[PDB]
Design a protein around this ligand. Structure first.
Ligand SMILES: [Zn+2]
Length: 196
């Protein structure tokens, strides 16, 4: 069902999680990113807020921020041989979350179906759920279904990436939610029980 009141409730929660950048930027698109984050189960959002995880929206490069200067010139895991570095990567998630405004869609310098959901899933995985993507249960599921969203040499190799991408499929919209259920039924059930 359409749940605009739930989206509003999660947006209110996100008002204490999202950090907007200093420069000038597409304010409507930044708002759209927060709206897409509001699709995440509010339980997870409040757990992130409890741990003081900030979702930083950026108007420049990731490596333009002081706290990510250590990534200048660094080649992401699995991107070796491409000539690309973290300077060009629009999203990072884990112990922090940082997201370049405008780069949400797949192919905008990254492979995720949605940037902000993929990166925020990393933080939920790592901060809230103590690296559940490395848990024995998820490793068994990943062994069977980890290639079934495609990108078999990336998602199919790194369980934390398969977790983050599956989470993004689960929460982006009903189409991606349905595609996940069909391609990765055990992963879908796992995320269902996790939110239950
Ligand atoms: Zn990732």
């Amino acid at each position: 069902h359409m749940d605009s009141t739930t989206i509003q409730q999660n947006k209110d929660t996100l008002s204490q999680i999202v950090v907007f950048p200093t420069g000038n930027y597409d304010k409507n698109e930044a708002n759209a990113m927060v709206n897409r984050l509001a699709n995440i189960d509010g339980k997870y959002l409040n757990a992130l807020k409890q741990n003081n995880l900030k979702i930083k929206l950026l108007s420049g490069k990731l490596t333009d921020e002081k706290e990510y200067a250590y990534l200048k010139g660094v080649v992401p895991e699995g991107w070796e041989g491409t000539g690309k570095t973290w300077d060009d990567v629009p999203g990072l998630g884990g112990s922090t979350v940082a997201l370049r405004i405008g780069f949400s869609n797949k192919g905008k310098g990254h492979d995720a179906i949605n940037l902000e959901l993929h990166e925020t899933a990393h933080a939920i995985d790592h901060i809230v759920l103590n690296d559940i993507s490395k848990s024995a249960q998820f490793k068994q599921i990943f062994a069977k279904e980890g290639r079934s969203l495609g990108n078999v040499n990336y998602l199919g190799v790194y369980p934390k990436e398969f977790f983050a991408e599956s989470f993004a499929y689960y929460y982006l919209n009903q189409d991606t939610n349905s595609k996940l259920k069909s391609a990765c039924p055990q992963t879908y059930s796992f995320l269902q029980n996790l939110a239950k």
